[PDB]
């Protein structure tokens, strides 16, 4: 076809691309945000929260961003006749950033570092500490 | 006496240490930015912090230079 | 259809050589069992989707 | 002592006349507007593009000929590129021999050439394939990455960095003297 | 006398500790910029940064090693 | 010319540490490379950038050499 | 024969960040054939380039032994 | 009195450097070994490159000891 980058980026609830051809793709990592372009080496990697970041072919300039809290990307080499390269953008939930709310954020973070502060359970420990962080990630995302 | 050059061209060793410190400081501000791209700030901020004492050393090993070549 | 499904018994019991044509970010034994279970849910959703 | 005679009857006849059309049979072979380009007809609008449109936001100008195959063969995937990219840019259609003027303020030597423009001289870049090595595809390939170029320097530095060059003072006349008549000049 | 010389010799020492901070932090520019592309530009600017010290960290001993030469 | 000799030997310590800098760049271009080859110059670009710092403080250190050994 | 043989056997000391830079770079060359075969040879030629400084600057340093050696 | 074996001595230094940089080799390579067993045989290919450099280098050294140590 081309030589273009196929993104499918895809909830359970909406797939948001199915066979998109992009020219970069930022993604955030559980070690660090990465752009996967063409050409890129097979790969998967678990992601942590923040800011997808599309930008097609016809854009260029031009970006489109979504939030993600948790899931997996697939980047899969370009076979021989198809002369294009695919990834896969599987996420538990994905919003786009216009979507959100730093009000209701900060609220969801007070609620959750009261829940917290008896710290007893490892579980909720983790789950108030990953709070804080997805939510901090989800306020310097917003607008 | 020429002999209280060699003291301080020893002390200047310390610097290339300093520097290396340095370099590693940064390369880690460079790979944190890539790695976290949002924030940009907090890193330069403890950057910024690590190199007031690295500064200061190689400030203090400068100044023990010169001392040792006047006196 | 039946679909025979992966275990962790059966994921030990391989050395998992098909997967070195892929870099995991984090390393092969530290994301796989966050991988499992992402495949053990997305396996139970089309299946019920199909059935449904 | 050098000197070209003026010209011919032959010379300055119709460049592009219209030959038989064949039936339905031999288009049948083994191998068998546009709403998002603009056919530039005249040096007029040539100038009024490249002063008005190629300032506000970038051009791109495929300039082929008839007698070039290569032309017939990057016409389409042009127009498949200008289909997909005229958000970005504006895209238009030359023929070297219906507006040589077009041709020589380009600065074009051979047919197919792509040409992004953008200030008309602040970013300038001619695509070809004066040797015979490269294929449509690459061309396309170029052109979208001088495109990308030139539109990631105009977003820099808060849209400067995008300024003219020599057409600020040389007005293309080394190029083409003609234009001394445009800014007014004698000729006496 | 001649004995300078050696001080000098020993002032050029820190080069070559400078070094390993330099090529820590373009390694981590180059290794970041494989990683974030998109990034670029701020990376570099960083290393500027980085070299803004760098690049006299050197210079500053190498003029010690003229200094502690002829004196 | 002894310790003049003496000199320009020991002013060729620092080699070592232009040579670890140049590995730590190829291995971070190579690494780099692995990863996106598509990036390929553009880091090229950077690892030159890089490349000719040290190639500048190597240049000097020989030129120092030469000094402390006919000077 | 003093200054001769030592500062030839001092300016022979460097080659060892030579043979750690030429370790790491080609460790670095067998991690990214680990990771991406398929650009194998597009890796090799970076690392020759590496030689083409590395062993370069050794053939400099191993020369400079000699010309102390008959200085 | 000791000046050519002091100065064989000083020569042997560089084969610690030697053998790091050959670790770092090995290491590399029973690293990508581990994680891509199908291509072993081509990275001990390289990692043989890699001696083929670092080995020779060493022979040298040793070559330059063994004409210190007799003048």
Request: proline share 5%.
């Amino acid at each position: 076809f081309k030589n273009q980058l196929l993104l499918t980026l895809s909830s359970p609830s909406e797939a948001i691309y199915v066979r998109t051809p992009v020219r970069s793709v930022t993604v955030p990592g559980s070690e660090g945000a990465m752009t996967m372009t063409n050409g890129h080496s097979q790969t998967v990697a678990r992601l942590k929260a923040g800011e997808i970041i599309v930008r097609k072919g016809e854009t260029g300039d031009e970006v489109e961003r979504f939030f993600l809290s948790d899931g997996f990307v697939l980047f899969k080499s370009p076979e021989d006749d198809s002369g294009c390269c695919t990834a896969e953008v599987l996420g538990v939930e994905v919003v786009p950033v216009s979507m959100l709310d730093k009000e209701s954020a900060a609220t969801a973070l007070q609620e959750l570092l009261q829940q917290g502060a008896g710290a007893t359970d490892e579980w909720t420990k983790a789950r108030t500490l990953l709070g804080q962080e997805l939510l901090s990630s989800v306020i310097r995302a917003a607008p | 006496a020429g002999v209280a050059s060699l003291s301080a061209a020893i002390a200047l060793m310390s610097v290339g240490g300093v520097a290396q410190g340095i370099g590693s400081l940064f390369a880690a501000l460079v790979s944190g930015t890539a790695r976290n791209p949002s924030i940009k700030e907090d890193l330069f901020t403890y950057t910024l912090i690590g190199m007031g004492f690295l500064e200061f050393l190689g400030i203090i090993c400068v100044l023990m230079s010169a001392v040792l070549l006047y006196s | 259809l039946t679909l025979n499904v992966l275990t962790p018994t059966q994921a030990a019991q391989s050395a998992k050589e098909q997967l070195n044509t892929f870099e995991f970010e984090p390393e092969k034994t530290d994301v796989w069992k966050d991988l499992q279970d992402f495949y053990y849910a997305c396996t139970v959703f089309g299946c019920m989707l199909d059935n449904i | 002592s050098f000197a070209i005679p003026p010209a011919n009857a032959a010379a300055l006849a119709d460049p592009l006349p219209a030959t038989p059309t064949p039936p339905p049979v031999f288009e049948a072979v083994s191998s068998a507007a546009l709403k998002n380009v603009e056919e530039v007809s005249t040096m007029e609008r040539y100038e009024a593009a490249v002063y008005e449109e190629s300032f506000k936001k970038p051009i791109v100008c495929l300039f082929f000929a008839r007698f070039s195959l290569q032309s017939k063969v990057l016409l389409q995937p042009f127009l498949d590129f200008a289909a997909s990219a005229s958000n970005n840019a504006t895209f238009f259609l030359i023929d070297c021999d219906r507006v040589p003027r077009a041709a020589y303020h380009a600065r074009v030597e051979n047919v197919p050439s792509l040409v992004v423009m953008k200030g008309d001289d602040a970013f300038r870049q001619t695509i070809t394939d004066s040797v015979g090595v490269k294929t449509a595809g690459d061309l396309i390939q170029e052109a979208r990455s001088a495109l990308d170029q030139v539109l990631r320097l105009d977003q820099q530095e808060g849209g400067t960095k995008l300024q003219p060059g020599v057409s600020s003072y040389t007005h293309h006349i080394g190029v083409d003297n003609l234009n001394v008549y445009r800014k007014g000049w004698p000729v006496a």
